[PDB]
Design goal:
The protein is an all-beta fold. It is classed as protein binding.
């Protein structure tokens, strides 16, 4: 029952919450467009490497979105299951930053992000298929 990142970032509880409690790690991500093409000059939305909040049940990756005001939808899917990415915190317009997190079992290292952003520049950025291969496999720590 997810919604639109543009109509969800407007919340008082997710306007400035401390999205950093418990354990956490750093995981980069490989951006590819069905052509193994890594665009290292398009850092307009994401900025730092995806984070990994390993909990007691399953691992929890995290990705900050600078242009949260440009995101409209989002349906990441790996193998054959679209994980419902949710939101944990989002900075207000002046800060423009949305925080989303999703579980990743089996050391998931590749997921097809599905979303479409628009900045009123010219056309519409529709990511029909975004191959994001994590820098490493995300394996939860049931024993640590």
């Amino acid at each position: 029952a997810d919604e639109s990142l543009k109509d969800a970032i407007k919340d008082p509880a997710l306007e400035n919450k401390e999205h950093d409690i418990g354990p956490r790690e750093q995981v980069n991500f490989q951006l590819l467009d069905k052509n193994n093409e890594t665009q290292y000059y398009h850092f307009f939305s994401i900025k730092d490497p995806a984070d990994v909040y390993y909990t007691k049940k399953k691992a929890e990756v995290e990705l900050d979105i600078n242009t949260a005001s440009t995101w409209k939808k989002f349906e990441v899917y790996e193998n054959n299951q679209k994980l419902p990415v949710r939101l944990v915190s989002y900075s207000p317009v002046p800060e423009d930053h949305a925080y989303i997190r999703f579980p990743v079992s089996d050391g998931t290292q590749e997921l097809k992000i599905v979303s479409s952003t628009q900045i009123d520049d010219g056309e519409e950025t529709n990511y029909d298929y975004t191959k994001l291969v994590f820098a490493k496999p995300i394996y939860n720590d049931p024993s640590l």
